[PDB]
C-alpha cells in the first residue's frame, strides 16, 4: 500500500549461513527474463565461471518466479559449503530481461 | 567468455505486417500471410552478461538452428548446444524490447555488432545494419504458443 514508485530491479543479496540469497524483480515482459550467479577467482587470472564449473562446494538452487501486485521477483540461492575453496572468489548475481541486464557483486 | 543453455520457448514470430516466419522446403528464413513456424527461442546465461542472449531454432524433419554466418541469415542443421564456447557466436542473438513499440522485439547479431534481424520484401529473414531510427522491418510480435 505504499504511494511510492516500485524500482526494479532494486537487486538485492542476503546472507544466511552457508547461502547468498539474490532477489530482484521485473515488470516488462516477465516472461523472457532469468537470473543466475557467476564467480571469479580474483586471485588468479582464469575466466569468470558458470557455477557448475566451479567443481565441488557450491551450487546454485533453481530459481523462484513469483508475482504479485503486476510485478515478477526473481530469487536464485547460491550455497558454497566450501568457504576455503572459494575465499578468494567474487560472486555476481545476474538478472537478465528484455530492458537489459543487471549484476551485483559479493564476497564471503 | 561462453553462454550456456536455459529454458526454450515455442514461439510463433511476425513481422511488421502480420506475416509469419516460417523455414520452407529450401531451409529458407521467409515470411508468409503448424511445425515449420513453430519456432524455439532458447535463452543463454553469458559469463560476460551483455543482454538477453538467444538461439531461435525450428523442427520441421530435424532441427535446424539460425545463423547469421558470413552476415548472411541461415538455417543450419544442428541442435542449439548446452554450451557455447565463443564470446561471439553465429547462432546467438541478443533479444530486445523495441524503443518506443514496447511490445515488439529485435534481435541482434552478437556476431556482427549494430546487424539486426529484419524481414526484406519473395518476404525474407535478412541481416541488416540498423541506419536509421524508427526501422520498423527489424520489429517483431513474438507469440507465445
Known amino acids: 500500500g505504499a504511494m511510492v514508485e516500485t524500482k526494479c530491479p532494486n537487486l538485492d543479496i542476503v546472507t544466511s549461513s552457508g547461502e547468498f540469497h539474490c532477489?530482484?524483480?521485473?515488470?516488462?515482459?516477465?516472461?523472457?527474463?532469468?537470473?543466475?550467479?557467476?564467480?571469479?577467482?580474483?586471485k588468479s587470472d582464469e575466466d569468470t565461471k558458470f557455477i557448475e564449473h566451479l567443481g565441488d562446494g557450491i551450487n546454485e538452487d533453481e530459481t523462484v518466479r513469483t508475482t504479485d501486485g503486476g510485478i515478477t521477483t526473481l530469487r536464485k540461492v547460491l550455497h558454497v559449503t566450501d568457504t576455503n575453496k572459494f575465499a578468494h572468489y567474487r560472486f555476481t548475481c545476474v538478472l537478465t530481461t528484455l530492458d537489459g541486464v543487471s549484476k551485483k557483486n559479493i564476497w564471503l | 567468455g561462453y553462454f550456456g543453455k536455459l529454458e526454450s520457448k515455442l514461439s510463433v514470430i511476425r513481422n511488421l505486417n502480420d506475416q509469419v516466419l516460417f523455414i520452407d522446403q529450401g531451409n529458407r528464413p521467409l515470411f508468409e500471410d503448424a511445425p515449420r513456424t513453430i519456432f524455439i527461442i532458447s535463452m543463454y546465461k553469458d559469463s560476460q552478461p551483455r543482454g538477453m542472449a538467444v538461439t531461435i531454432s525450428v523442427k520441421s524433419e530435424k532441427i535446424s538452428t539460425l545463423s547469421s554466418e558470413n552476415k548472411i541469415i541461415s538455417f543450419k542443421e544442428m541442435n542449439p548446444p548446452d554450451n557455447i564456447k565463443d564470446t561471439k557466436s553465429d547462432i546467438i542473438f541478443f533479444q530486445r524490447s523495441v524503443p518506443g513499440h514496447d511490445n515488439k522485439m529485435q534481435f541482434e547479431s552478437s556476431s556482427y555488432e549494430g546487424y539486426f534481424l529484419a524481414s526484406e520484401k519473395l518476404f525474407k529473414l535478412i541481416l541488416k545494419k540498423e541506419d536509421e531510427l524508427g526501422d520498423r522491418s527489424i520489429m517483431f510480435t513474438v507469440q507465445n504458443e
Open chain 1, 23 to 42: 532477489s530482484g524483480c521485473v515488470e516488462h515482459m516477465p516472461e523472457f527474463s532469468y537470473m543466475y550467479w557467476l564467480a571469479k577467482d580474483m
